[PDB]
Structure 1
Amino acid sequence: MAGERFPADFVWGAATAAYQIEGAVREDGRGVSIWDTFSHTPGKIADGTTGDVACDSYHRYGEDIGLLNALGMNAYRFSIAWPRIVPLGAGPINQAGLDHYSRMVDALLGAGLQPFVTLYHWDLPQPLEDRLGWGSRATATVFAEYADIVVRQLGDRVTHWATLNEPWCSAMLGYYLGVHAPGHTDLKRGLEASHNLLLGHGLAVQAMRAAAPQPLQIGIVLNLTPTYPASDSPEDVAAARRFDGFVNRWFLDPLAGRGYPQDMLDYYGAAAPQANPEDLTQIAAPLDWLGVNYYERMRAVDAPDASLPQAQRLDDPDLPHTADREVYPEGLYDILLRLHNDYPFRPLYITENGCALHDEIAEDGGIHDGQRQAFFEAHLAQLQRALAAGVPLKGYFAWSLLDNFEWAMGLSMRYGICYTNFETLERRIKDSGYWLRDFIAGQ
């Protein structure tokens, strides 16, 4: 395994999110989230499905633990559902929710699985959305409150915490492009949501450190899409830069204490939120790690007629595609080298990486997902290149542990290393899962 070995203390996991797996949407005091409302809105989800049952992991998380162990993982990245903890968003605690996750943490730790807890993976309580949701500063305050409550109960056992998952998605897909909950379609509302998300992050970090019974390792998780111009023309380079600012720098820079990127501010003009010095200070609260969710690159062509940021993807039919994305492993090297050299966050974790395929159970009973195996091998090779470059990477989480409710695509789009039969709830490990098992064991 020359050149293939990762650090002996490397974190090896798989990842999930509460609304995608849990089900039990009305049980044990759970409130209504924006994704309950959105999934039950006609035509918002591709295939008529909802998260009402999903993988039934509310009841079945011991099965999930069994899979993690069968895989020889040493960690599990999962989210806590705010609707189970503070059903009204701003309001009383629901102790049955806290006690469920407490039991789940003890089960994980008992099994030798470090919990990597995401506080916010998109399931905003609907009552908050009724009051503008991420469009309101008050939501930031009450998000920090929620962070406080959870860390008070679980922070004697869970050291590693992420405040938000992918605030670009929450803001832009949820408030600008309308493809995620709550489903609004206004640029200024998306940018305002981005700010309040960032603010909430920063407020929560401070709240968590105060509320914690021991020192924590607190991070945030960002989707990053390395962007490349399709030519070196001024037009295509500028288009690459705008897309890069839209997705990456818009979040990285304020987190890094650099304020919002001025190119973007000027570009958005009227639509840009008002960002006082005080909020930017709070947004840059010191972090102990950064999580990177990596799936794809953007090869950008100028598109003056399109919506902001006026940049279209140029498809490359020479690169392989999965069920829903282009495969470009080298982009993971590039993005990590950029973070290592250009930004201050360290250590880094790959909090998600994975792919969707048209997975089926074969005649023999296995799932022969060689493309997903190759996806992991190629990305893990790039991570070995990045580590050889000095990048302080401390773990890797495959998205996902098991096939699940894939947001607007529903149960139809399978990302698991384990196959989920949605009718019987049986899980079965796919070939890529066995590969990860044996790679991790070998070391």
Structure 2
Amino acid sequence: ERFPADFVWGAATAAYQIEGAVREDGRGVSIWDTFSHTPGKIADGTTGDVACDSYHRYGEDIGLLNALGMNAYRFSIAWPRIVPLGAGPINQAGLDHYSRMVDALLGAGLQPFVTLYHWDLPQPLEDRLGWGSRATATVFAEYADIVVRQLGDRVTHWATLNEPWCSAMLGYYLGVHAPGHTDLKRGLEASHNLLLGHGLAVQAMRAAAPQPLQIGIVLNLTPTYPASDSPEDVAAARRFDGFVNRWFLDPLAGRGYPQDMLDYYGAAAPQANPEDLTQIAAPLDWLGVNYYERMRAVDAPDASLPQAQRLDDPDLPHTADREVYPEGLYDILLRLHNDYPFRPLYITENGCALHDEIAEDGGIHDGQRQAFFEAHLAQLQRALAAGVPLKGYFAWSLLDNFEWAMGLSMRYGICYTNFETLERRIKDSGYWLRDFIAGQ
């Protein structure tokens, strides 16, 4: 029934998805500015140029967090505002903005949980191969140092990267996210340099920190289940599990890259000398789990890598874009608790998209999103009962925002955003979360 008294209850955003003000106060160009302004890349012709205008309206966002009774806010810092050239001088005006934001959050009793990298790589670094270059890992660590020196007197909880699998595989292999390349070797090289940048940044942040910090990384994880017990289907499930989950979990845990995936990738695998792997395994103080769906895998030898296709379950509920399987959150947390060394754990992203509209009465009656939260929170109680060291939960997202290649057309907020007027309104699910948290 009851969560621990000191549990962290928050909502989460990312800078490019909400901030707007893309040319203000010295901000440089990110890969997502370039990508969203490329014809045909965004489903609805929108960009993040304005988004929720949270660069100017973060006070309203704080008012929403307060109205919801949250005690934490997970947000990201835009590297293009801090080091507009990617590698080069700092932009003090960008640091001052986030310093004021942090003070406003603390004044409201909200603990900041800061993500350093949520996909907005400075374009000048992509012009020099982006995450395909080891140099980008080095300058990411320099950026991390700069930010912790100025904000680490007030922010204790930091994550280096959000979802490196997406940055590497969607951005460099499948081409659906910025920068939009379509080359497997590039994607795997990017995955290595992202992990190396994480490891270098952890060490840089600890040396620059004015006080002890709690440093983590945030991974999207997908529990995978074979469609049958045949050797082919079980092997497909293992391959998909390696492709998404173990490729990142194992090196972070000091276990190297998984050998079965190295064999499967062959010559496309990155060159990883042991010195890099030692750096990648820098000790972490927590791990963030982003959880949305499961994968029920069937062998697909004709399909592209990793030759495993999803077996849709038409009996399960579906949102605007995903299948709902709350029990997979329990499964993945138990697996992490039993099989990997990371603890404590936070749920850093959990939420769903729906075709939300404002009803005649003025509210947003998003019953499926309420049911989504209720079902996933029940699985967290089961995980806690099993001894999983869970310390907090962040709903994705505080407000409807720019959903990457889907644009403004895919609403994940617990608050509704009118993109024409920038008004925010709490959805029914947000009031349910408020009242549930108040009961705790």
Q: With structure 1 as the length reference, what TM-score do the two structures score?
A: 0.99
Shift of 1:212: 0.3
Shift of 1:94: 0.3
Alignment partners' CA distance in 2, 1:134 and 1:330: 34
Counterpart of 2:144 (choices 133, 147, 160) is 147
Alignment partners' CA distance in 2, 1:306 and 1:143: 35
Shift of 1:257: 0.2
SS in 1 for 2:25: coil
Alignment partners' CA distance in 2, 1:363 and 1:327: 28
Alignment partners' CA distance in 1, 2:229 and 2:408: 41
SS in 2 for 1:116: strand
SS in 2 for 1:147: helix
Shift of 1:246: 0.3
Partner of 2:30: 33
Alignment partners' CA distance in 2, 1:408 and 1:242: 27
Shift of 1:166: 0.1
Q: Deviations over 1:370-413 (max 9, x none)?
A: 10000000000000000000000000000000000000000000
SS in 2 for 1:28: helix
SS in 1 for 2:437: helix
Alignment partners' CA distance in 1, 2:114 and 2:104: 14
Q: Deviations over 1:36-93 (max 9, x none)?
A: 0000000110000000000000000000000000000000000000000000100110
Q: Deviations over 1:158-208 (max 9, x none)?
A: 000000000000000000000000000000000000000000000000000
Alignment partners' CA distance in 2, 1:302 and 1:213: 51
SS in 2 for 1:232: coil
Alignment partners' CA distance in 2, 1:227 and 1:175: 23
SS in 1 for 2:400: coil
Q: Deviations over 1:200-227 (max 9, x none)?
A: 0000000000000000000000000000
Counterpart of 1:360 (choices 351, 357, 367) is 357
SS in 1 for 2:26: coil
Alignment partners' CA distance in 2, 1:63 and 1:7: 29
SS in 1 for 2:346: strand
Q: Deviations over 1:265-299 (max 9, x none)?
A: 00000100000000000000000000000000000
SS in 1 for 2:395: strand
Alignment partners' CA distance in 2, 1:102 and 1:230: 50
Q: Deviations over 1:280-322 (max 9, x none)?
A: 0000000000000000000000010111100000000000000
Alignment partners' CA distance in 2, 1:211 and 1:117: 16
Counterpart of 1:55 (choices 44, 52, 55) is 52
Alignment partners' CA distance in 1, 2:56 and 2:2: 36
SS in 1 for 2:429: helix
Alignment partners' CA distance in 2, 1:179 and 1:237: 28
Partner of 1:111: 108
Partner of 2:203: 206
Q: Deviations over 1:247-272 (max 9, x none)?
A: 00000000000000000000000100
Partner of 2:406: 409
Shift of 1:232: 0.6
Identity of aligned residues (%): 100
Q: With structure 2 as the length reference, what TM-score do the two structures score?
A: 1.00
Q: Deviations over 1:324-382 (max 9, x none)?
A: 00000000000000000000000000000000000000010000001000000000000
Q: Deviations over 1:96-127 (max 9, x none)?
A: 00000000000001100000000000000000
Alignment partners' CA distance in 1, 2:229 and 2:67: 49
Alignment partners' CA distance in 2, 1:276 and 1:306: 31
SS in 2 for 1:372: helix
Alignment partners' CA distance in 2, 1:296 and 1:109: 33
Q: Provide the aligned C-alpha RMSD in A.
A: 0.3
Partner of 1:440: 437
Shift of 1:431: 0.4
Alignment partners' CA distance in 2, 1:122 and 1:216: 23
Alignment partners' CA distance in 1, 2:33 and 2:300: 35
Counterpart of 1:302 (choices 294, 299, 302) is 299
Structure 2 gap segments, 5+ residues each? none
SS in 1 for 2:165: helix
Alignment partners' CA distance in 2, 1:231 and 1:100: 53
Alignment partners' CA distance in 1, 2:358 and 2:235: 46
Alignment of 1:381-392 (within 5 A): 381-392=378-389
Matched, 1:380 2:377: yes
Counterpart of 2:230 (choices 223, 229, 233) is 233
Alignment partners' CA distance in 1, 2:370 and 2:255: 39
SS in 2 for 1:394: strand
SS in 2 for 1:275: coil
Partner of 2:342: 345
Alignment partners' CA distance in 1, 2:40 and 2:238: 34
Q: Deviations over 1:133-154 (max 9, x none)?
A: 0000000000000000000000
Structure 1 gap segments, 5+ residues each? none
Moved over 4 A (4+): none
Alignment partners' CA distance in 2, 1:98 and 1:49: 28
